[PDB]
Design a protein around this ligand. Structure first.
Ligand SMILES: Nc1ncnc2c1ncn2[C@@H]1O[C@H](COP(=O)(O)OP(=O)(O)NP(=O)(O)O)[C@@H](O)[C@H]1O
Ligand SMILES: Nc1ncnc2c1ncn2[C@@H]1O[C@H](COP(=O)(O)OP(=O)(O)NP(=O)(O)O)[C@@H](O)[C@H]1O
Ligand SMILES: CC(=O)N[C@@H](CCC(=O)O)C(=O)O
Ligand SMILES: CC(=O)N[C@@H](CCC(=O)O)C(=O)O
Ligand SMILES: [Mg+2]
Ligand SMILES: [Mg+2]
Lengths: 258, 258
């Protein structure tokens, strides 16, 4: 087996049937034309915000991470580990892909602990064991992994999905692509930045250009590049014609260099 | 590998920390003292009703099955495939059990189709492929399987969990135990019925003694007994002292005979 490729999916993609169809088309074409085994990691913040909206609950993000009280972890788990993961497994079945849905605790794939009492049930993700997912890959399944985990003491944890993808890339020795609703990291004028180093990201954060979850996204991508010794791309899932080349390694967004 | 044992869990069990602790204690003791491999299937109607309650949505059951409109399948999936399944995987991690969470579509373990347009997205469960779960069992994992499935065309389906457990028992050739909040099937005076045949269940249904989901439960148990050629028990998860003997084969509730 080749090193796998993790494709991380998030943003408003799940709210778009058309975008899901175009993505699954491109995944089936990549899978039928590449020996490298695919793994999907996903977020779903929008699914949570909608269920929180319907419940009249506030959305507080502290430094790009969603504060997750003990009274909200069950609902967030339902939206992310349930609705978002099973919507993706249904698109995979429609496209004749044998997928297996997982969260971070299955096979201890990604180790999670409480990151900060000020955040509640938000996890810090770190590498775990590759045995279960390697076994699924060797048997021809596509793992589809949500960003909920669980601590050794049994408490469910909400992990930001970019950090969960980075931890899983380190666990499997996988290449990584972070797909979002924007074409990579944007500069002060809203233009795509083609390449990113740690020095440059420090400068942009100092200048207040990179903010919110983007700060979390870039730092997760940088950690992955240094840990794997390979570039990591941040790119958009929006434009159909770009998907095939993107999955083949062409630079469509921001290439993070370590 | 021995034929597995499926333990189906539902009712208000998930709302009871104390009952969950006593159950997981008993599962760990059974696992460490028995070569027979365990599989858990679960429902979670109460988790759904609570999230529907908080959303101001009605609960309509038509012949013991929950009508599941297209505008409710995502929320029901979140509660059952997400919150209930991951709460069980967290109790398994707390007890040092390596579990893997699945729904019915993973490995095509249980085939699901639309049962009736009058019910919406309710599935009819039928046997599927045992390969994925047999592989997990041989590698020492405890599968924990929710009762959401997916059709070949990609539509998520809500399956009653007793029928999903019966279909999975036929797929794996497994023994089955249906655990509920009541001590088996009760007669007209609210007393436990020790043994049940198809003739007797027909009589009780004719007399209006067995109703609602109990009709669905008994018919699922009868189908499983005839299909496996082995008795199937319906019993309570409520009383701690009875759990060990129950998992060892002692009659604690209603033994359905085919
Ligand atoms: N300098 C910046 N460049 C690009 N995007 C930025 C920047 N600063 C902030 N953002 C924001 O970063 C968001 C990207 O992160 P995020 O909103 O969490 O999406 P996601 O991770 O793709 N989705 P999900 O997994 O569901 O959370 C964009 O849509 C912008 O609102
Ligand atoms: N004759 C009867 N004997 C016993 N229980 C009966 C009878 N008639 C109706 N019931 C009902 O059957 C219920 C059992 O089915 P059900 O309510 O769906 O629980 P469950 O399947 O254990 N849980 P879950 O998986 O979460 O749905 C009982 O609690 C009774 O309300
Ligand atoms: C802690 C944390 O922010 N979690 C994310 C997980 C989903 C994602 O990355 O989209 C969240 O929105 O709640
Ligand atoms: C269709 C159907 O009734 N589904 C069940 C699944 C959960 C269970 O059995 O508890 C339900 O309540 O919605
Ligand atoms: Mg994000
Ligand atoms: Mg029931």
């Amino acid at each position: 087996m080749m090193n796998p490729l993790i494709i991380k999916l998030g943003g408003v993609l799940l709210d778009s049937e058309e975008a899901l169809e175009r993505l699954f088309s491109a995944l089936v074409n990549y899978r039928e034309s590449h020996q490298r085994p695919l793994v999907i990691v996903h977020g779903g913040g929008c699914v949570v915000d909608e269920l929180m909206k319907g419940l009249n609950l506030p959305v507080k993000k502290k430094n790009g991470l969603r504060v997750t009280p003990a009274d909200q972890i069950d609902i967030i788990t339902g939206a992310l580990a349930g609705t978002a993961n099973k919507t993706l497994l249904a698109w995979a079945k429609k496209h004749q892909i044998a997928a297996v849905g997982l969260f971070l605790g299955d096979g201890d794939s990604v180790k999670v602990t409480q990151l900060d009492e000020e955040l509640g049930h938000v996890g810090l993700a770190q590498p775990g064991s590759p045995k279960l997912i390697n076994s699924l890959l060797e048997n021809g399944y596509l793992p589809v992994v949500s960003s909920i985990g669980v601590t050794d003491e049994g408490q469910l944890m909400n992990v930001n999905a970019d950090q969960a993808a980075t931890a899983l890339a380190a666990t499997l020795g996988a290449d990584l692509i972070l797909l979002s609703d924007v074409s990579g990291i944007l500069d002060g004028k809203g233009q795509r930045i083609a390449e990113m180093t740690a020095a440059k990201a420090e400068q942009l954060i100092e200048q207040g250009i990179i903010t919110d979850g983007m700060i979390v996204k870039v730092n997760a991508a940088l950690d992955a590049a240094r840990t794997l010794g390979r570039p990591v791309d941040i790119a958009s899932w929006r434009h159909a014609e770009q998907l095939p080349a993107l999955f083949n390694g062409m630079p469509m967004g921001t290439r993070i260099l370590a």
